[PDB]
Design a protein around this ligand. Structure first.
Ligand SMILES: *[C@@H]1O[C@H](CO)[C@@H](O)[C@H](O)[C@H]1NC(C)=O
Ligand SMILES: *[C@@H]1O[C@H](CO)[C@@H](O)[C@H](O)[C@H]1NC(C)=O
Ligand SMILES: *[C@@H]1O[C@H](CO)[C@@H](O)[C@H](O)[C@H]1NC(C)=O
Lengths: 107, 228, 103, 109
C-alpha cells in the first residue's frame, strides 16, 4: 500500500504522467479517480479500450515491462483534474487499488 | 569422617555441557598424600583430579575428586564408584551414586493489577508444571539478553497433590513499574530433558494478556468474495 | 502502531491489538482487539466447485484462526469442465478465478 | 488463558511476598469451609533477591478446569504475625478482572 503523493503541476498545454507498479502478468491494470461525493472509484484508464467520457482522446497508456514502472500520461489539463488517482490490478476497481496519489493544477 | 559423591546436574550440562561426577571427602583426620579414584562398571579409568581446597577453619582437611566422562556415559546408565582411602581404616572406602516420564508445559502469569498500583515492583512468575523428573532449568531473557540470578529466583523443584506423576517448580522475576510502560517482553526460557531442543521459550507483555476493550468489525459485502 | 497479530487470508479474519497511550495517570491502560472478519455472502460450500448450496453458516473460532469462505488472491483455483463439441469429450481444466493465476 | 484451553485443570496461585520474619501460614477457604491439605501445596519462604531482610512464598491450589468456570471464589487466607489483625485474605472469580466492554461494529453496506 504505497502513497506517493506528488505535486506535478499542470495546465492546458501541460502534460503530466503518473507512475504505477505492474505485476506484469497481463491482468487488468487501471488508473482510477476516486470520487469524494460518490464514495466509490471510477476508472479513468483501464487495460481495455475504455476511456472516461471527460478524458476521451486526451489520455495515453504507456507500459514498460523492462523497468517496472506503469505510467499514464495526460495531454491537456483543464485544471479540474485534482483528485485521488489510484493505480491497481485485478478485475475489481475500488478494492484492488495498489498505490494512490493526487495530482495538481498550476504547480 | 565425611564422604559424599554427587552426579552432574542439569544446571551445568545446559549452561556449559561439562558433565562430570564429583566426590567430596572432608571432616577426616589431617593427613595429606591421599589417593582418590573413580571406577566405572566396565573397567575404564578417569581423568586426573585437581583444585583441592585448603584446610577447613575447624582444623580438618578437605578433598575433591573429579570424574570427567563423555555426555553419553551418564545417559546410558553406567554406575560409578569413588575410591577414597585414609590412614586409619585400611579398607578403601567406596561410594556408589546411580540413576534418575512426562514433559510438562511452561505457563507465564503476568503480575496482578493490585501489585502494579503500588508503582514499586511487578513480579513475573513462570510456572513449570507437569514435568518429570526433577532438576528442570529456568532462565529469564530481557530483549534476548540473558538474565542473571541476581534479579530472579526459582522454586527448588517440587511435587503434585492429586497426581504423583510429575512434579512442579516455579520462578519469579522482580522489576520496577516504569519498566512496565515499555515492556521488554521478559521471555522465560526453560531447559528440561523431555524437550526436543531443550528450549520452550515463552513470553508475555502488556500487548498480550487480558484486554479491556474488544471491537469486532465484521463487514458484509456482496463482492468481497475473494478476501484480498 | 498496531502489531499484526493475525492476518488470516483464507477465512479473512484480521485480528490485531495495540496499547492505547492514555494520559499520564496510573496505568489504567486499554488493550485493543480489532478483529475484522469480512463476510463473502456469495461464495459456495466448497470454495472450489460452483455446484453446492451457496453459504448459510460463518463459523469463526479465533483459536483455529492463526474449509474456507474466501479466495486467496495469490492462489489459483481451477476445475475440470466437461465440454464436448460433438461426440468426443475433452474434459479440460477451467478457471474459477481468472486473474489470480495464469497458465 | 493458555492453561484453561487444555480443558484439564485450573491453577490458582496465592503469592505471599514482602513479609518478615519467616513462618507464614497459608490456607485455602471456599464458602467458609477450608479445603483439604491435599488440594493445595505451600512452598517454604525464600529471601527476596533485592530486599535484604524480607521473604516470599507461594501456594498453589489446583482444581478441575470445569469447576473454575462457574463463579466459585477460592479465597486464600494468610496468617502472619505482622498483619494488623494477624489474618488477611484475597479472592478471585471467573469474573474478577474488568468491564471488558464490547464495541461491535456490524456492517451491512
Ligand atoms: C476499535 O477501537 C479503536 C480504539 O478503541 C479505534 O481506534 C478503532 O477505529 C476501532 N475499530 C473500528 C473498526 O472502528
Ligand atoms: C466440493 O468439496 C469437496 C470437499 O472438499 C472437494 O472435493 C471439492 O472442493 C468439491 N468437489 C468437487 C468434486 O470438486
Ligand atoms: C470503539 O470505541 C472507540 C472509543 O471507545 C470508538 O472511537 C470507536 O468508534 C468504537 N468502534 C466502533 C464503534 O466500531
Amino acid at each position: 500500500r504505497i502513497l506517493p503523493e506528488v505535486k506535478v503541476e499542470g495546465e492546458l498545454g501541460g502534460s503530466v504522467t503518473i507512475k504505477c507498479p505492474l505485476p506484469e502478468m497481463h491482468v487488468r491494470i487501471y488508473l482510477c479517480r476516486e470520487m469524494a461525493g460518490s464514495g466509490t472509484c471510477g476508472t479513468v484508464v483501464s487495460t481495455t479500450n475504455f476511456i472516461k467520457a471527460e478524458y476521451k482522446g486526451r489520455v495515453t497508456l504507456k507500459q514498460y515491462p523492462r523497468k517496472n514502472l506503469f505510467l499514464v500520461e495526460v495531454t491537456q489539463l483543464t485544471e479540474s483534474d485534482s483528485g485521488v488517482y489510484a493505480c491497481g490490478a485485478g478485475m475489481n476497481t475500488d478494492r484492488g487499488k495498489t498505490q494512490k496519489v493526487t495530482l495538481n493544477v498550476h504547480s | 569422617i565425611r564422604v559424599f559423591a554427587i552426579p552432574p546436574s542439569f544446571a551445568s550440562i545446559f549452561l556449559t555441557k561439562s558433565t562430570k561426577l564429583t566426590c567430596l571427602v572432608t571432616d577426616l583426620t589431617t593427613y595429606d598424600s591421599v589417593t582418590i579414584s573413580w571406577t566405572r562398571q566396565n573397567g575404564e579409568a578417569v581423568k586426573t583430579h585437581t583444585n583441592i581446597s585448603e584446610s577447613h577453619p575447624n582444623a580438618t582437611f578437605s578433598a575433591v575428586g573429579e570424574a570427567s566422562i563423555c555426555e553419553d556415559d551418564w545417559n546410558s546408565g553406567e554406575r560409578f564408584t569413588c575410591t577414597v582411602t585414609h590412614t586409619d581404616l585400611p579398607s578403601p572406602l567406596k561410594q556408589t551414586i546411580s540413576r534418575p516420564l512426562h514433559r510438562p508445559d511452561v505457563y507465564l502469569l503476568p503480575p496482578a493489577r493490585e501489585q502494579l498500583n503500588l508503582r514499586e515492583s511487578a513480579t513475573i512468575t513462570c510456572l513449570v508444571t507437569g514435568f518429570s523428573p526433577a532438576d528442570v532449568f529456568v532462565q529469564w531473557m530481557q530483549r534476548g539478553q540473558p538474565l542473571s540470578p541476581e534479579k530472579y529466583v526459582t522454586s527448588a523443584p517440587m511435587p503434585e497433590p492429586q497426581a504423583p506423576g510429575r512434579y512442579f517448580a516455579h520462578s519469579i522475576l522482580t522489576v520496577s513499574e516504569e519498566e512496565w510502560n515499555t515492556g521488554e517482553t521478559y521471555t522465560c526460557v526453560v531447559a528440561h530433558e523431555a524437550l526436543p531442543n531443550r528450549v520452550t521459550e515463552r513470553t508475555v507483555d502488556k500487548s498480550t494478556g487480558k484486554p479491556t476493550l474488544y471491537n469486532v468489525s465484521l463487514v458484509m459485502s456482496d463482492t468481497a468474495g475473494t478476501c484480498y | 502502531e498496531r502489531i499484526v497479530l493475525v492476518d488470516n487470508k483464507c477465512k479473512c479474519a484480521r485480528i490485531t491489538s495495540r496499547i492505547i497511550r492514555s494520559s499520564e495517570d496510573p496505568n489504567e491502560d486499554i488493550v485493543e482487539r480489532n478483529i475484522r472478519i469480512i463476510v463473502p455472502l456469495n461464495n459456495r460450500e466448497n470454495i472450489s466447485d460452483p455446484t453446492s448450496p451457496l453459504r448459510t453458516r460463518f463459523v469463526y473460532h479465533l483459536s483455529d484462526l492463526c474449509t474456507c469462505y474466501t479466495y486467496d488472491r495469490n492462489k489459483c483455483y481451477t476445475a475440470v469442465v466437461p465440454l464436448v463439441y460433438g461426440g468426443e469429450t475433452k474434459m479440460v481444466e477451467t478457471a474459477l478465478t481468472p486473474d489470480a493465476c495464469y497458465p
